[PDB]
RNA sequence: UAAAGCUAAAUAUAUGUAGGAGACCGAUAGCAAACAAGUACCGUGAGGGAAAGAUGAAAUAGUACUCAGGAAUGAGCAAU
RNA sequence: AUUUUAAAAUUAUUUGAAUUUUUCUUCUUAUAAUUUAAGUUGUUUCUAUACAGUACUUUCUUAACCCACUCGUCUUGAAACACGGACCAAGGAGUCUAGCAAAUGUGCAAGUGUAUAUGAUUCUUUAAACAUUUUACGCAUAAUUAAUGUAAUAUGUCUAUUGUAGAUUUGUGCCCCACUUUGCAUACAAUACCGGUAAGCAA
RNA sequence: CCUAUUAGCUGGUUAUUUUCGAAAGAUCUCUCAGGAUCGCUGGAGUUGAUUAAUAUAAUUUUACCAGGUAGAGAUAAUGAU
RNA sequence: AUUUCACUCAUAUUAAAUAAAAUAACUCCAAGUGGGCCAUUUUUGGUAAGCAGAACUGGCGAUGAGGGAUGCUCCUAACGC
RNA sequence: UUACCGAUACCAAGCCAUAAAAAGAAGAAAAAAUUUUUUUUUAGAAUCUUUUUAUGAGUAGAAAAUCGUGGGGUUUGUGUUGAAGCGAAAUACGUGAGUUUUCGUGGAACAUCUCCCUAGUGCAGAUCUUGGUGGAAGUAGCAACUAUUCAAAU
RNA sequence: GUCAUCUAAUUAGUGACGCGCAUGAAUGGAUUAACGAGAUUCCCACUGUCCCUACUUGCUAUCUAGCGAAACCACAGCCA
């Protein structure tokens, strides 16, 4: 990989592509994020707007396991289960699938997307969106709370 | 001396040759370059041009979008120079004849089960040399995450560009310049 | 030491090197801060037109698909 | 000055020499483009060491062919003349520098009975 | 810094060359552990080395 | 890697402003040749290289498992076509067919003499001669680094059960073995070259289908692996061009300047 | 369930010793040191610290003899 | 090797006409040729009736006419009375790692990467190759808010928001164009819906 | 020995050909020998054009605008004389 | 105001002329640069200056060639062999 | 008032490269001898082939294609009938970096351009590092301490 | 600075004068015999310091035999 490097093609060019006037010096602007708010301020404000300052209150120790909550929208509930069983459930109107999304790894069911019309489906989840539940029972299904 | 733009040489922009050294893709490019030259077909010219494009400019097309685009022509075939990906949000598929570079396994199985079929571009050239009953389609070329960082810099007024940040919590690029309470907003 | 304070020399040919670019002049302009109580009414007009067109099209589709 | 022998035109002879290599022993005559700042040769001052350029390139119809109007092919084996059996009229053969006397004699014999000319025919004898 | 890059965050301001270590012997250690457990399950003569949990 | 502090194990001192000498560090003291000489610096004798080589170079690479399996499948397919093997350099002009497979009793032969005899009787006498006469001492200083010889690669024997193949075909220069369940891309495509002469036992040839998905079994088939699918259905683009359907579509031949 | 105590394994090893290797260096390189090298030598001292490998297959073939020179050497019709 | 063709001109016949009324008058009818077409061909000598020279090719050394200031560098500006260079050899400087992004190639794709680790008649090579009893983890798949949190048309319908341009397709006037048909990507807008904030109401 | 400390400063920075080709303005900066940012430049790519036309133009014409510099004035104002 | 239906307003030279106008437009990544100087014309400070500071355009810089004996900037004219 | 001289500018032609374009995935021509022989060719590589037009300064800077070096895999080679290296060269090739040959020396290894992998990979400079060597130059100089002489021996 | 004196001639010295840029009392003021390789002016003596240079001795230089460096060095070395 070292023979594909751009410095190789400037082998006999004196300045190595770094300029004859400005030269390549050692940290001519500072080190790291040195000049923020002083002479790199234009860069900071143009590319990282809200960088300086603090907002909000502290959460002293977090324990992300408490609030871990993967989500799934209602438009993927039918795609969760295999194609042949999807065909069977759609064909037979006397029975409906009850899907435990927690086993697949989802805690909350969100309401984005379109469910199939007149296809009942029961969903078991730890949390439900209001619109998700509305669509579930609009297509004739039911939401079941589990823990 | 002569006063000419660019010293008098016409300058083209974009790809001139295939970069991929994939022998099958090179054969396909050769075949469709010949087809575009020997026929007048803008169809063949466009396919030859698109077979050359980088990966980001032959994006995947989902099955749902494929069927939605093919909804009003049930008898024609859909030609995509990208890949066809399965869409779990789609409940049912219906009899699609689609030529594409590659099909994901799930999309291929779903199309075959629905009763349509998947075609390669060599078969497309064999059966429809001039693209009769063939609808050229392409996926969203500007939907990728890289494009979300492009355009006006994040910090320009009314800029929708995402910034480059390690994480997106309350304490990462959210204080001064992004809300009125700290200096200015945006 | 004493520095050259200012000059506009070469700025015009720099500007003309990539030409004086003109605004794109799009067909439609956002109406965000323009004439409220007029563009709101225009939204109502468009909704009414769309509702009439859609109901007529739905009637035609239902009567043609039986 | 150009030299013209039959269809062959050599647009320039007397190969370019490195600037100032005539009066510095550490500077070898092999051509190097003077990068410099005020380098005379780089600026193309009159009367000093002109630089090579693509304009001197030879006609590609007669580019690589020798004064015998044939392209040279360097062989180190008797087995490397099979391509020349079908190209005996536009290829001449040259024996590699590190080929022994036995193999040289064999190669000359094969070339003659293949009526392919040999450039360095009388080497090592 | 320059251009539109993420703001640098690299924690290499101490003497890190003394703390770099690279495992050339990952699979060698795999073999050694496998050999050791094979040897002890041969030594105990039939009874498994695993314990019920 | 070089020794960690190589060239920097002297006393640092560059007293060189006004001494009429370059400002490079000089070793101190006197009474020896080293005193006053240029100390550490890539341009100084005994001064330490520019960027000392380190052991934390990226020695290895992580290769996608799917790409590795694709490469192995492609190498097998390439070994299956006669022209590719000839191009790679095996003298196979006399064997009957290039996906050649032999009875499972090859796995049981145990004498190198009879292994060579079988190889010759298959029609690979020229291949064996090439292998045996390719042996010769390499150029360069690699031969003082335990790399004395350089051999050419011959047939790769792929077996299922080792009943003597391993200790019958080794010691034949350029010949290597490989169990069918542990196929190695390094052996299948030496140097990245395409298509190696492969001698399959019948059992290994049959087991290939089991390994790659047909008639699967629990502990043999690659779990949930699907063979790569081609971009083109049939690469005979000139046959498709000469097909009458596209021949009718082609316009009349036009003329150059 | 503090203010008493013990305890193997998985872990680390720019040291010493001993093995084995390398897409490493090939005598201004590689350890400072391929060698009589931390030696010679320098500094009151703490310390500083080199240079230096190759006849030939075989010297169990290391130049016999003669001439000229005080000798070193040189020359030979002499010699490995 | 299927335009050095066709024609154009000219010559020799030939048909009719015109006319400036003719030994270069013009326009065609047919034939046969030629080049002024359709980028140089011919003759005679010499080399030479030799196997390397006094010739021819070439290298070098010398002259001669014209031209030619010391290179590198900083600099607006260097041949500079600016600095470095007495000479030669060998050594001698954008690299390595981490992390991010863009670009491009490759594999798979709403998934992707099998991490550490395990097994295996693999154990010179091999410290690599191969493999992983039907929710490990990272990134992505959803955003927004300091935050309790909340979380994307909405069950009239397996239609999949609406326009203006727009690729491709469909027919009518298998290859020119104007009407039809469809409406990718994308651009410009409009709409809904989600989170936050205002405002109104608020059991 | 930490330490190959740091240096916005000086010096150096190694093959060929080909193609494209600058800036020495500007804004902010404990800034004035520096830096970030814009401009100028290269490379990559797409959309277009390839239809002697449309987009387009350091150009003119036609139509319509805006100006208070040169000139003029001192008897029109102000200020001089 | 929007939407849908009608009719039709030069295009066969193109709703004025001309146009090696698509060598366009756009997007991404990034280099160098951010000491300038000179000439014509205009112009401020200064007795003035090869002085200091500005405006337009062209150059020098970054560029050789012919001429001005000579000359970084003048005239002609910009450069493959 | 004429004529003339006078550029790397202009014009015509050739050739190189760059850019763009038009187009393209199978058959006998000639000559020399004497119906028969002989001599050449008888093409089809798509980052390719043929043809056409325009164009070509360039620091800082960018890119592409090339040329070399140590080492690795693959392939296929040269060496005691003399390898590497080195000196001088060549009717040699290239525009050029270079490549390839000859003679001499040398006395044991050396390439791989088939494709690829890898790097401690290319020097005129750094008051560069180490070593060697110059002109200065048979020059400066061998100047304190009063002073030596005759004969003999070795 | 002005006035005397010193000289032929005095930006020097000494003695006086004092609205003293900006003197002054252990920041010590004023004065002092003796002392000083301390600074300064004048006089006598003395003389090559000079008018104005000359001659002369030793040791070098010089030529020879022998021995034998170095600094400096882009390339070099006539001028208007």
* Residues of chain A contacting residue E3, judged by C-beta atoms under 8 Å apart: 43, 47
Residue of D nearest to A20 (CA): D37
Q: Is the CB of F6 under 7 A from strand G?
A: yes
Cα–Cα distance measured from residue D104 to residue D124, given in angstroms and rounded to the nearest whole number? 8
Cα–Cα distance measured from residue D94 to residue D120, given in angstroms and rounded to the nearest whole number? 6
* Residues of chain B contacting residue E4, judged by C-beta atoms under 8 Å apart: 149, 153, 164
Written as six digits, the tokens of B33 are 């370059």
Q: Is the CB of F141 under 7 A from strand G?
A: yes
Other CB atoms within 10 A of residue B91 CB? 17
Q: What per-residue string of b and e applies to B153-173 under the rule 16 or more CB within 10 Å gives b?
A: bbbeeeeebebebeeeeeeeb
**Residue A52 contacts B where some CB pair is shorter than 8 Å:** yes
Nearest nt (C1') from A9 Cα: I15
* Residues of chain F contacting residue B24, judged by C-beta atoms under 8 Å apart: 230-232, 235
Q: Who among residues 53-92 of B has its Cβ near strand I, under 7 Å?
A: 53-54, 57
Query: In this complex, does chain D touch chain C, defined as having at least 3 beta-carbon pairs under 8 Å apart?
Result: no
Cα–Cα distance measured from residue F107 to residue F110, given in angstroms and rounded to the nearest whole number? 8
Q: With contact defined as beta carbons under 8 Å apart, do F135 and F174 qualify?
A: no
Which residues have a Cβ under 8 Å from the Cβ of C57 and sit 6 or more positions away? Answer: none
Decide the pairing of beta strands A98-100 and A122-125: parallel
**Residue D102 contacts A where some CB pair is shorter than 8 Å:** no
Q: Which three-class secondary structure state does DSSP give residue A101? A: helix
Cα–Cα distances in angstroms (integers) from residue A99 to residues A82, A125, A128, B92, in the given order = 12, 9, 14, 19
Q: Is the CB of D31 under 7 A from strand I?
A: yes
Q: Is the CB of D23 under 7 A from strand L?
A: yes
Q: With contact defined as beta carbons under 8 Å apart, do B147 and B138 qualify?
A: no
Cα–Cα distance measured from residue F179 to residue F175, given in angstroms and rounded to the nearest whole number? 14
Inter-chain touch B31–F233, beta carbons under 8 Å = no
Most distant CA pair in chain A, distance: 84
Number of H helices, E strands in chain B: 5, 5
B 115-174 residues with CB < 8 A to E: 149, 153, 164-166
Written as six digits, the tokens of F17 are 């402003």
Q: With contact defined as beta carbons under 8 Å apart, do D94 and D68 qualify?
A: no
Q: Is the CB of D1 under 7 A from strand J?
A: no
Query: In this complex, does chain E touch chain D, defined as having at least 3 beta-carbon pairs under 8 Å apart?
Result: no
> From the CA of E41, how many Å to the nearest CA of chain F?
24
Which residues have a Cβ under 8 Å from the Cβ of F137 and sit 6 or more positions away? Answer: F143, F148, F149, F150
* Angle (nearest 5°) at CA F178 between F195 and F184: 60
* Å: D60 CA to G55 C1': 56
By CB atoms closer than 10 A (0-12, 13-18, 19+), residue B110 is buried
Cα–Cα distance measured from residue F181 to residue F185, given in angstroms and rounded to the nearest whole number? 12
E 1-53 residues with CB < 8 A to F: 20, 22
Q: Is the CB of F232 under 7 A from strand L?
A: no
Inter-chain touch B173–A47, beta carbons under 8 Å = no
Q: Which three-class secondary structure state does DSSP give residue B36? A: helix
Helix then strand then coil, % of chain B, to nearest 5: 35, 15, 50
Long-range contacts of the stretch A25-33 (C-beta < 8 A, 24+): A32/E1, A32/E8, A33/E1, A33/E7, A33/E8
Q: Who among residues 38-67 of D has its Cβ near strand K, under 7 Å?
A: 42, 44, 46, 52-61, 63-67
Which residues have a Cβ under 8 Å from the Cβ of A63 and sit 6 or more positions away? Answer: none
Query: In this complex, does chain A touch chain E, defined as having at least 3 beta-carbon pairs under 8 Å apart?
Result: yes
Q: With contact defined as beta carbons under 8 Å apart, do A111 and A130 qualify?
A: yes
* Residues of chain E contacting residue B165, judged by C-beta atoms under 8 Å apart: 6-7
Q: For F181-242, give the DSSP string.
A: GG--HHHHSGGG-S---EEEEHHHHHHHHHHHTTT--TTTSPTT------SSS---HHHHHH
* Å: B8 CA to K5 C1': 35
Residue of B nearest to A114 (CA): B89
Query: Would you state the torsion angle of the CA atoms of residues D43, D46, D52, D54, taken in this order, to the nearest 10 degrees?
Result: 90
Q: With contact defined as beta carbons under 8 Å apart, do F159 and F165 qualify?
A: yes
The alpha carbon dihedral of A29, A31, A33, A37 has a sign of negative
Inter-chain touch B175–A52, beta carbons under 8 Å = yes
Cα–Cα distance measured from residue F61 to residue F82, given in angstroms and rounded to the nearest whole number? 32
The single-letter DSSP state of residue A53 is: S
* Å: A99 CA to G42 C1': 89
**Residue F231 contacts B where some CB pair is shorter than 8 Å:** yes
Q: With contact defined as beta carbons under 8 Å apart, do D49 and D19 qualify?
A: yes
Inter-chain touch E4–A51, beta carbons under 8 Å = no
Q: Is the CB of A17 under 7 A from strand I?
A: no
Cα–Cα distance measured from residue B102 to residue B61, given in angstroms and rounded to the nearest whole number? 11
Which helix (H) or strand (E) element contains residue B134? strand B134-137
Of E1, E3, E4, the CB nearest to A33: E1
Written as six digits, the tokens of F228 are 């790569």
């Amino acid at each position: 990989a070292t023979r594909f490097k751009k410095n190789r093609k400037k082998r006999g060019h004196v300045s190595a592509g770094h300029g004859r006037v400005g030269k390549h010096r050692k940290h001519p602007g500072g080190r790291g994020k040195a000049g923020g708010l002083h002479h790199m301020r234009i860069n900071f404000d143009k590319y990282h707007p809200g960088y300086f300052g603090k907002v909000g209150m502290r959460h002293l120790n977090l324990l992300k396991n408490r609030t871990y909550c993967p989500t799934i929208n209602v438009d993927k509930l039918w795609g969760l289960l295999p194609e042949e069983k999807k065909k069977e459930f759609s064909e037979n109107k006397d029975i409906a699938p009850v899907i435990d999304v927690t086993r697949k790894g989802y805690f909350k069911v969100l309401g984005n997307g379109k469910l199939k019309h007149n296809q009942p489906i029961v969903v078991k989840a730890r949390y439900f969106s209001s619109v998700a539940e509305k669509k579930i029972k609009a297509v004739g299904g039911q939401c079941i709370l589990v823990a | 001396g002569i006063a000419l733009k660019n010293v008098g040489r016409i300058k083209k922009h974009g790809r001139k040759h295939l970069v991929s050294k994939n022998p099958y893709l090179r054969l396909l490019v050769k075949l469709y370059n010949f087809l575009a030259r020997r026929t007048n077909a803008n169809f063949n010219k466009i396919i030859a041009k698109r077979l050359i494009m980088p990966k980001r400019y032959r994006p995947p097309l989902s099955l749902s979008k494929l069927q939605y685009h093919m909804a009003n022509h049930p008898n024609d075939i859909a030609v995509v120079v990208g890949s066809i990906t399965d869409d779990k949000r789609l409940f049912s598929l219906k009899q699609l004849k689609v030529c594409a570079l590659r099909f994901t396994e799930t999309a291929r199985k779903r199309i075959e089960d629905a009763g349509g079929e998947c075609l390669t571009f060599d078969q497309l050239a064999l059966k429809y040399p001039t693209g009769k009953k063939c609808v050229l389609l392409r996926g969203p070329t500007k939907a990728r995450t890289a494009e979300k960082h492009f355009g006006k810099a994040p910090g320009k007024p009314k800029s929708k560009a995402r910034p480059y940040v390690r994480s997106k919590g309350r304490k990462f690029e959210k204080a001064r310049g992004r809300r009125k309470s700290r200096a200015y907003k945006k | 030491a004493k520095s050259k304070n200012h000059t506009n020399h070469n700025q015009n040919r720099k500007a003309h090197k990539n030409g004086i670019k003109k605004p794109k002049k799009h067909k439609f302009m956002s109406r965000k801060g323009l004439d409220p109580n007029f563009f709101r009414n225009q939204k109502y007009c468009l909704k009414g037109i769309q509702k009439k067109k859609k109901e007529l099209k739905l009637k035609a589709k239902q009567e043609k698909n039986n | 000055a150009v030299k013209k022998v039959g269809k062959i035109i050599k647009k320039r002879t007397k190969k370019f020499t490195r600037f100032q290599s005539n009066r510095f022993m550490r500077v070898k005559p092999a051509w190097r483009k003077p990068r410099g700042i005020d380098c005379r040769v780089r600026r193309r001052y009159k009367g000093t060491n002109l630089m090579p350029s693509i304009g001197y390139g030879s006609n590609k119809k007669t580019k690589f062919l020798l004064p015998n109007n044939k392209y040279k092919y360097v062989v180190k084996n008797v087995k490397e003349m099979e391509p020349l059996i079908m190209n005996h009229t536009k290829y001449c053969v040259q024996i590699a520098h590190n080929v022994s006397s036995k193999k040289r004699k064999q190669i000359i014999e094969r070339a003659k009975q293949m009526n392919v000319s040999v450039i360095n025919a009388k080497a090592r004898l | 810094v320059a251009h539109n890059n993420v703001l640098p965050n690299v924690h290499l301001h101490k003497w890190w060359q003394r703390h770099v270590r690279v495992n050339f012997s990952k699979n060698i250690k795999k073999k050694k552990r496998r050999l050791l457990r094979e040897k002890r399950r041969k030594a105990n003569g039939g009874t498994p080395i695993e314990k019920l949990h | 890697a070089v020794k960690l502090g190589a060239g920097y194990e002297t006393s640092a001192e560059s007293w060189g402003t006004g001494r009429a000498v370059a400002r490079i560090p000089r070793v101190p003291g006197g009474g020896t040749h080293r005193a006053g000489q240029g100390a550490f610096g890539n341009m100084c004798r005994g001064g330490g290289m520019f960027n000392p080589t380190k052991i934390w170079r990226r020695w290895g690479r992580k290769v996608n498992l799917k790409e590795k399996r694709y490469a192995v499948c492609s190498s097998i397919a390439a070994s299956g076509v006669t022209s590719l093997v000839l191009a790679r350099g095996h003298r196979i002009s006399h064997l009957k067919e290039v996906p050649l497979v032999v009875s499972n009793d090859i796995e049981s032969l145990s004498k190198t003499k009879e292994a060579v005899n079988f190889l010759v009787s298959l029609g690979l006498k020229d291949e064996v001669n090439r292998l045996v006469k390719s042996k010769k001492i390499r150029a360069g200083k690699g031969k003082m680094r335990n790399r004395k010889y350089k051999i050419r690669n011959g047939p790769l024997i792929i077996y299922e059960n080792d009943n003597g193949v391993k200790k019958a075909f080794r010691n034949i220069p350029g010949v290597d073995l490989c169990k069918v369940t542990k196929l190695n891309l390094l052996k299948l495509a030496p140097g990245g070259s395409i298509g190696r002469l492969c001698i399959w036992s019948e059992s290994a040839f049959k087991k290939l289908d089991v390994i790659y998905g047909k008639i699967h079994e629990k502990k043999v088939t690659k779990k949930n692996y699907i063979l790569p699918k081609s971009i083109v259905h049939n690469p005979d683009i000139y046959r498709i061009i000469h097909s009458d359907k596209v021949q009718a579509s082609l316009l009349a031949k036009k003329k150059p300047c």
